Amino acid sequence: RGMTSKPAGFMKKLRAAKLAAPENEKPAPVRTHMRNMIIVPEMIGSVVGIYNGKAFNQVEIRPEMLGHYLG
Amino acid sequence: KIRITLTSTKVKQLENVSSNIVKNAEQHNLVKKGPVRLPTKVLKISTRKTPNGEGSKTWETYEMRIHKRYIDLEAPVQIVKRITQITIEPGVDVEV
Amino acid sequence: IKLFNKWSFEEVEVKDASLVDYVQVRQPIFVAHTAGRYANKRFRKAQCPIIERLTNSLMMNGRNNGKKLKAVRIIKHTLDIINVLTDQNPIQVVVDAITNTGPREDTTRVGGGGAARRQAVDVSPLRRVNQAIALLTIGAREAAFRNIKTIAETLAEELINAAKGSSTSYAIKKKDELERVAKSNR
Amino acid sequence: NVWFSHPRRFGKGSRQCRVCSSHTGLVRKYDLNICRQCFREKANDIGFHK
Amino acid sequence: SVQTFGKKKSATAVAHVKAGKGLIKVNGSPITLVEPEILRFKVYEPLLLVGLDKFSNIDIRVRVTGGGHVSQVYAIRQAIAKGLVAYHQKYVDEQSKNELKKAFTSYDRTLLIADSRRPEPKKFGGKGARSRFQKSYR
Amino acid sequence: VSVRDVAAQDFINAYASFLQRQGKLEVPGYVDIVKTSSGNEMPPQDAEGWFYKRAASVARHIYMRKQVGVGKLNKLYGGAKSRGVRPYKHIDASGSINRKVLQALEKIGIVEISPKGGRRISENGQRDLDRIAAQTLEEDE
Amino acid sequence: SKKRKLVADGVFYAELNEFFTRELAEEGYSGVEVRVTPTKTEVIIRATRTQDVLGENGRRINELTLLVQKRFKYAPGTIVLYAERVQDRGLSAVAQAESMKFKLLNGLAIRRAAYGVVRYVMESGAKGCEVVVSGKLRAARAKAMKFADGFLIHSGQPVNDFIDTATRHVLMRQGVLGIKVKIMRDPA
RNA sequence: GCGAUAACGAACGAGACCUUAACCUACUAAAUAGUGGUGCUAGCAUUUGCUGGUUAUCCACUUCUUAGAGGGACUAUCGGUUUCAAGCCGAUGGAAGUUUGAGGCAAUAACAGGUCUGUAUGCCCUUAACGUUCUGGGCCGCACGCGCGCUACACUGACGGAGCCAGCGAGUCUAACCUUGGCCGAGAGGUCUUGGUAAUCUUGUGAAACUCCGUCGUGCUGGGGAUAGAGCAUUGUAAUUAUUGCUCUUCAACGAGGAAUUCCUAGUAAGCGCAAGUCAUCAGCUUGCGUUGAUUACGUCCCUGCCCUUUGUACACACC
């Protein structure tokens, strides 16, 4: 997996995290159907909203999870 | 060896140009290792005639018979220049 | 002639007289008889008739996957087993068995719907060879499958029961079946 | 569709036919042909290719 | 020298036959070493067939490419046989055609003529391979 | 004699006995971490523990083909569609075996490097092959 | 030759054909021969009337050779163009099929098309002339009307007969309608 | 094809031309291999010599393959049968038999056969939108049924090690195929260097079936394999939905299948690998190839399709 030399963190969601985190944690689930990103420590707390197909099933993103993709 | 190679469609244009290099280019000052035949630079395949759709029961064999001759000219002296006299039979693709 | 540069037909006595005329040990139809090995096991006996027709029926039935490459080891490696066991020529013993497993008169079937009409037809030499080896191998491949026994031991044991005459044997027993129904419905 | 030379990602703008719009398994050697379909038609026109 | 051809199932058996010495060289290695398995009595087969034994008599040097252990042992064999009839003695060698025809005698798929066999696939419509279907009298 | 006169398998076994005597060839300890972790019992010919039997095979192939490449003595030349191919990309299990074996044989004077890529087999190499091939051939006859 | 890009020169032949189908239509199109010298195609176009292809002091022949190198979907090359005459009209099946279809479009019926043209071809020479007119025969439903003069009915043996083949279309209020014409010359 | 005949001659089909495989041969010969003129590298041996692999340039010699071309097979020759016809039946000669094997050819017409989604196109339509663009999710859903392939229920063999062998085809024109040499490292994985090839090299003897020998010993196992969980790549943006695969571990259904039904006519199914086609990238498919290769017709009674003559008809929108 992309770890060594450029991990695949999509640049649009880094702009989302720098906005929504220093204000107030948004208790409504923000929809984010982007699967191909590496999860980073500025995403902790805030409810990211990956789609599945027919349904959604609520994120609580923890400080223990960082390293993987949204998978 | 000064590599000349000829290739054309069918036999009729090929016989003239091949024999003309033996006549015109070669004489005494040129020794060629000579006028060879070789296998054809062919590409055959069997497929179906209807391209997919109705009818699995239909066939069409194909080829591209592009008859090569090599005909290599060995001695690289004065007479290797006189090939510029033969420019006849287009359809023959000369390649040097 | 010489089969694997040792055993021949000149040390072999022939039983059935009409098989001398037709099937010749020159090449059509080769009267040297041997089969019964898989892997490495030296059991007892050998025997399976006509080596030309051990390319034929014996191959496909087997029981083996793989065709002739299997079959040539079955034929070859069993020759030595009977040579030291009964101390016989591997051909001679089963020149007795070939006529016992081959019928004289057989029955054809013709299917008129769901009716089996078994009517008599005569045999005589040539068919008696291959239909007998078909009878050996069909009984052998099923007896290797349906109970714990390799094709080595199955083919080996069978043909002295076929030669002398026993109801243990498949091939003499099915020869009886087909022959007696011909002479009945004639 | 595909014929716009700037797709979003590298692999979006795939391959398409010239003649039709059709997509379903084209040819690398000839970027034309519906799928299989004009391969044998344009053989009957002139020439051949593998 | 005397040379000859002889193939079956794709092969190029380039069999030189020569007087003096009697070592059987197969490419660049002897007879026993190239073919170590079981079928290699076949390459020694038409040698002793002619009447007298070899090693003392005629030298054999083959080149061969093309053919498995099933094919090569017939390709070399067929070329030694086809070069036997083309050889020179004092009476000479032409009537060994008939005795190489009498090698695999009376069902003549011999050693004069070829095994004209090229094992390709299995067929559609009945049951099929080589030697035609359905006969009571076979 | 040559390496051709003696058989394939048993030459590799016979040569492997003398290979163990020479203390340039050591086991870097790879194949003791496979055959025991398996179930597989392999008796002393089949056994290979390991650099002795594998060095005897590899060195025999430089008599039989002779031309260049550690890579073309690793896998025969191209075809490692059986078991695992590795050409440009970083070398695996098969890689670290064969780069070591021809390095260790070079410190004897068995293999040398010829200038069109990789290995040949030299003077003390073919001595250590075909002299042992003679001794085995005398036991065969 | 050409091992490599066949989809370079191969598509350029098609682009050239699409030029002279539209341009050389009234002048009487038959076909173009494109023998390829490196970076120079021949483009010997064959018209029935070459007087118009040249034009007034050779203005249209200069126009055609410029535009076929560049307008939209064309490669340059630095090629040439020659205007050659079609000898006769009747013997060429592509020329006859074109004129038959023009008569169908204009307002001449299918029987006064077919019977008139086969006579003309047998008068100039030929061997046989098959004129199969398919589609809507004078506006109706679909099917064929054959009719041929000479020895030319379904080829008339393969061998060597030298048959000029043609297909041509018509757009008309009714529908699209085709024709298939064969004209056999002499054994060659 | 031959006799008979109120007919006699001829055309479109078909038997041939063409393409490919089986084989011979003179002459000119390209690429490959071997051998020598100088070999090169090395052993074994006291030496003579014998044994092995590699490879360039110019020439010679031996060889293999193809293409320009010239042929060979015609029921020709022989025996038996038949009216002493046509034909059959077998045999000889040969590399090859009765149009040699396989392609290519699809008459005249019909089924108002299928294709308006290939393009072409009559007319009907819709047009701030049955147009266009952005992105996600669907096409992988499911509670069952049907059709076609793949794999197994095995010693028909499995497992470990060693060894012998084929043919058809691919590979940038400025993003190729691939040999090499070292370095990350549980896998799928390329930047860079060097060398060959425009197909001489390379994919491919690290090519299976198979063979040798040993072990397991008929038990859901040493059988079979779905499924799950557990360690990563200087690029292919990137593989949760939806990638193959590699090591440990999970070790199911299944132990040969009813009523019923399909395919397999002599190197072209079974069994067995290998290669191409689409392709940035997902085959068990399609397409093409070689290797090992056979059980069985006495006989057309019945079944299904097709052909000819005779025969009954109230049948005729095509003979529902």
Buried/exposed code over B13-41 (b: 16+ C-beta within 10 A; e: otherwise): bbeebbeebeeebbeeebebeeeeeeeee
How many CB atoms neighbour CB C162 within 10 A?
Answer: 28
Distances (CA, A) of F4 to F127, F128, F133, F136: 14, 14, 8, 12
Buried/exposed code over G1-38 (b: 16+ C-beta within 10 A; e: otherwise): eeeeeeeeebbbbeebeebbeebbeebbbbbbebebee
- Please name the residue of chain C whose CA is at the shortest distance from the CA of residue E109: C27
Interface residues on G facing B, Cβ-Cβ cutoff 8 A: 1-2, 35-37, 42
Among all strands, which nt has the closest C1' to E136 (CA)? H298
DSSP-derived secondary structure for G52-99: HHH-TTSHHHHHHHHHTTSSSS--------EEEEPS-SSS-HHHHHHH
Q: E22 with E56: CB under 8 angstroms?
A: yes
Q: Does D49 touch chain G (CB under 8 A)?
A: yes
Q: Is the CB of F100 under 7 A from strand H?
A: no
End-to-end CA distance of chain G: 27
R_g of chain B computed on alpha carbons: 19
**Residue G99 to residue G88: CA distance in whole angstroms:** 13
Question: Residue D3: what residue type?
Answer: W
Beta bridge partners of C47: none
Q: Which residue is nearest to nucleotide H108 (CA to C1')?
A: G154
Q: Which residue is nearest to nucleotide H107 (CA to C1')?
A: G154
How many CB atoms neighbour CB E133 within 10 A?
Answer: 9
Q: Does G3 touch chain D (CB under 8 A)?
A: no
How many CB atoms neighbour CB A36 within 10 A?
Answer: 12
Q: Which residues in window 51-90 of F are less than 7 A from strand H by Cβ?
A: 57, 60, 63-85, 87-90
| Residue contact D29–G13, C-beta within 8 A | no
Nearest to D21 by CA among D9, D33, D36, D39: D33
Strand order in the sheet with E12-19: E12-19, E58-65, E24-26, E29-30
Q: Please name the residues in contact with B83: beta carbons below 8 A apart, sequence gap of 6 or more.
A: B4, B21, B24, B25
Burial of F87 (C-beta count, 10 Å sphere; 0-12/13-18/19+): exposed
Residues from chain E that touch C105, judged by Cβ atoms under 8 A, are: none
Count of helix runs (H) and strand runs (E) in chain C = 8, 2
Q: C62 with C137: CB under 8 angstroms?
A: yes
Burial of C159 (C-beta count, 10 Å sphere; 0-12/13-18/19+): buried
Beta bridge partners of F117: none
Structure's resolution in angstroms: 8.9
| Residue contact E106–C108, C-beta within 8 A | no
Q: Does E30 touch chain F (CB under 8 A)?
A: yes
Q: G92 with G164: CB under 8 angstroms?
A: yes
In this complex, the residue of C27, C126, C127 whose CB is nearest that of residue E107 is C27
Mutation test of the interface with chain B: which of D22, D24, D39, D48, choosing the one with the most B Cβ atoms within 10 A?
A: D48
Beta bridge partners of B62: B45
Burial of C154 (C-beta count, 10 Å sphere; 0-12/13-18/19+): buried
| Residue contact B90–G1, C-beta within 8 A | no
Ramachandran bin of B15, using left for φ above 0, alpha for ψ from -120 to 50, beta for the remaining angles: alpha
Beta bridge partners of G182: G130, G165
Instruction: Dig out the tokens for G43 from the structure.
Output: 């483009």
**Residue G170 to residue G148: CA distance in whole angstroms:** 22
Count of helix runs (H) and strand runs (E) in chain F = 4, 0
**Residue B40 to residue B69: CA distance in whole angstroms:** 8
Nearest to F52 by CA among F30, F23, F20: F20
Phi, psi at residue E74, to the nearest 5°?
-105, -30
In this complex, the residue of E29, E30, E36 whose CB is nearest that of residue F7 is E36
**Residue C37 to residue C150: CA distance in whole angstroms:** 8
Q: Where are the alpha helices (DSSP H) in F20-111?
A: 51-64, 93-106
**Residue B6 to residue B22: CA distance in whole angstroms:** 13
Question: Residue C155: what residue type?
Answer: L
In this complex, the residue of E38, E107, E136 whose CB is nearest that of residue C28 is E107
Instruction: Dig out the tokens for F77 from the structure.
Output: 């030349």
**Residue E31 to residue E45: CA distance in whole angstroms:** 12
Nearest to C30 by CA among C5, C53, C46, C14: C53
**Residue C37 to residue C58: CA distance in whole angstroms:** 12
Q: Checking DSSP bridges between strand G177-184 and strand E58-65, what pairing results, if any? A: unpaired
Do chains F and E touch, with touching meaning 3 or more CB–CB pairs less than 8 Å apart? yes
Nearest to F27 by CA among F35, F129, F118: F35
Q: How far is G123 from chain B (nearest CA, A)?
A: 33
Question: Residue G186: what residue type?
Answer: D
Q: Checking DSSP bridges between strand G40-41 and strand B72-73, what pairing results, if any? A: unpaired
Question: Residue A29: what residue type?
Answer: P
Q: Does B52 touch chain D (CB under 8 A)?
A: yes
Q: How far is E64 from chain C (nearest CA, A)?
A: 23
Residues from chain F that touch E33, judged by Cβ atoms under 8 A, are: 4-5
Nearest to F103 by CA among F30, F28, F25, F32: F25
DSSP helix, strand, coil percent of chain D (3-state; round to 5): 20, 0, 80
Q: Is the CB of F8 under 7 A from strand H?
A: yes
Nearest to C175 by CA among C141, C140, C135: C135
Please report the number of interchain residue pairs, chain E to chain F, with beta-carbon separation below 8 angstroms: 7
Measure the CA angle with vertex A66, ends A65 and A68; round to 5°.
90
Residues listed for chain E: 138
Residues from chain E that touch C109, judged by Cβ atoms under 8 A, are: none
Question: Residue C22: what residue type?
Answer: Y
Q: Which residues in window 107-146 of G are less than 7 A from strand H by Cβ?
A: 141, 143-144, 146
Q: C69 with C148: CB under 8 angstroms?
A: no
Q: How far is the CA of G148 from the C1' of H4 (A)?
A: 38
Q: Is the CB of B28 under 7 A from strand H?
A: no
Question: Residue D19: what residue type?
Answer: V
Q: By three-state DSSP, how is residue B8 classified?
A: strand
Instruction: State which H helix or E strand residue G137 sits in.
Output: none
Q: What is the DSSP letter of G122?
A: H
Residues listed for chain B: 96
Q: Please name the residues in contact with G188: beta carbons below 8 A apart, sequence gap of 6 or more.
A: G160, G162
Q: What is the DSSP letter of C81?
A: H
**Residue E57 to residue E23: CA distance in whole angstroms:** 10
How many CB atoms neighbour CB E80 within 10 A?
Answer: 28
**Residue F27 to residue F32: CA distance in whole angstroms:** 9
**Residue F99 to residue F96: CA distance in whole angstroms:** 6
Q: G181 with G131: CB under 8 angstroms?
A: yes
Q: What is the DSSP letter of F103?
A: H
Q: Where are the alpha helices (DSSP H) in chain G?
A: 6-23, 25-28, 51-54, 59-67, 93-106, 111-124
Question: Residue E127: what residue type?
Answer: K
How many CB atoms neighbour CB F99 within 10 A?
Answer: 15
Q: By three-state DSSP, how is residue C7 classified?
A: strand
**Residue C80 to residue C73: CA distance in whole angstroms:** 12
Q: G132 with G179: CB under 8 angstroms?
A: yes
Instruction: State which H helix or E strand residue F8 sits in.
Output: helix F8-19
Burial of G175 (C-beta count, 10 Å sphere; 0-12/13-18/19+): exposed
Question: Residue C180: what residue type?
Answer: R
How many CB atoms neighbour CB D12 within 10 A?
Answer: 11
Residues listed for chain F: 141
**Residue G96 to residue G109: CA distance in whole angstroms:** 16
In this complex, the residue of C26, C108, C126 whose CB is nearest that of residue E106 is C26
Elucidation technique = cryo-EM
DSSP-derived secondary structure for C94-158: HHHHHHHHS-SEEEEEEESSS-EEEEEEE--SHHHHHHHHHHHHHHHHHHHHTTT--HHHHHHHH
Instruction: Dig out the tokens for F64 from the structure.
Output: 């039989």
Q: By three-state DSSP, how is residue G105 classified?
A: helix
Q: Does F65 touch chain E (CB under 8 A)?
A: no
Measure the CA angle with vertex E23, ends E18 and E28; round to 5°.
95
Q: Is the CB of E96 under 7 A from strand H?
A: no
Q: G68 with G88: CB under 8 angstroms?
A: no
Instruction: Dig out the tokens for B91 from the structure.
Output: 């359809």
End-to-end CA distance of chain D: 29
Q: Does G115 touch chain D (CB under 8 A)?
A: no
| Residue contact F8–E29, C-beta within 8 A | no
Mutation test of the interface with chain E: which of C2, C3, C26, choosing the one with the most E Cβ atoms within 10 A?
A: C26
DSSP helix, strand, coil percent of chain C (3-state; round to 5): 45, 10, 50
- Tokens 């034009």 sit at which residue? G55
Measure the CA angle with vertex F98, ends F93 and F103; round to 5°.
135
**Residue C83 to residue C45: CA distance in whole angstroms:** 8
Q: How far is E30 from chain F (nearest CA, A)?
A: 8
Q: Does E102 touch chain C (CB under 8 A)?
A: no
Q: By three-state DSSP, how is residue G111 classified?
A: helix
**Residue C101 to residue C49: CA distance in whole angstroms:** 10
**Residue A43 to residue A67: CA distance in whole angstroms:** 12
- Tokens 């070859």 sit at which residue? C76
Buried/exposed code over E81-100 (b: 16+ C-beta within 10 A; e: otherwise): bbbbbebeeeeebeebbebb
Q: What is the DSSP letter of D19?
A: S
Q: Is the CB of C66 under 7 A from strand H?
A: yes
- Tell me if the bond preceding F76 is cis, omega within 30° of 0: yes
- Give the relative orientation of helices F123-140 and F51-64 as an angle to the nearest 10 degrees: 100
Nearest to E69 by CA among E129, E130, E11, E136: E11
| Residue contact B51–D50, C-beta within 8 A | no
**Residue A29 to residue A25: CA distance in whole angstroms:** 10
Beta bridge partners of G37: G40
R_g of chain G computed on alpha carbons: 19
Q: By three-state DSSP, how is residue G117 classified?
A: helix
Q: What is the DSSP letter of E2?
A: B
Q: Please name the residues in contact with G3: beta carbons below 8 A apart, sequence gap of 6 or more.
A: none
Give the alpha-carbon dihedral of A32, A34, A35, A41, to 10 degrees: -60
- Tokens 């008139």 sit at which residue? G116
Nearest to F25 by CA among F131, F83, F88, F101: F101
Residues from chain G that touch D49, judged by Cβ atoms under 8 A, are: 6, 10
Q: How far is F7 from chain E (nearest CA, A)?
A: 8
Question: Residue E133: what residue type?
Answer: F
Q: Is the CB of G2 under 7 A from strand H?
A: no
Phi, psi at residue C7, to the nearest 5°?
-80, 140
Distances (CA, A) of E1 to E19, E26, E54, E60: 10, 17, 19, 12
Q: C95 with C160: CB under 8 angstroms?
A: no
**Residue C183 to residue C105: CA distance in whole angstroms:** 7
Q: C68 with C59: CB under 8 angstroms?
A: yes
Write out residues 7-66 of G within 8 Å (CB-CB) of D: 7, 10-11, 13
Nucleotides of H under 7 A from a protein CB: 11-13, 16-17, 19-20, 22-24, 28-31, 33-35, 41-45, 50-55, 58-59, 62-69, 94-96, 103-105, 107-110, 112-114, 117-123, 132-139, 141, 154-157, 159-167, 169-170, 172-174, 178-185, 187-195, 198-199, 202-218, 232-241, 246, 263-272, 274-275, 277-281, 287-299, 301-302
Instruction: State which H helix or E strand residue E18 sits in.
Output: strand E12-19
Distances (CA, A) of C6 to C10, C91, F38: 11, 12, 46
Buried/exposed code over C55-82 (b: 16+ C-beta within 10 A; e: otherwise): ebbbbebbebeeeeebbbebbebbbebb
Q: Does G188 touch chain D (CB under 8 A)?
A: no
- Tokens 């030929």 sit at which residue? G126
Q: Please name the residues in contact with F26: beta carbons below 8 A apart, sequence gap of 6 or more.
A: F51, F104
| Residue contact F5–E36, C-beta within 8 A | no
DSSP-derived secondary structure for B12-81: HHHHHHHHHHHHHT-SSS--EEE----------EEE-SS-SSS-SS--EEE----EEE--EE---SGGGS
**Residue C137 to residue C50: CA distance in whole angstroms:** 13
Q: What is the DSSP letter of F72?
A: G
Q: What is the DSSP letter of F87?
A: S
Burial of E111 (C-beta count, 10 Å sphere; 0-12/13-18/19+): buried
Beta bridge partners of G41: G36
**Residue B6 to residue C67: CA distance in whole angstroms:** 49
Q: C81 with C42: CB under 8 angstroms?
A: yes
Mutation test of the interface with chain E: which of C9, C27, C37, C133, choosing the one with the most E Cβ atoms within 10 A?
A: C27
Torsion over CA: G70, G74, G76, G79 (sign): negative
Q: How far is the CA of F90 from the C1' of H197 (A)?
A: 25
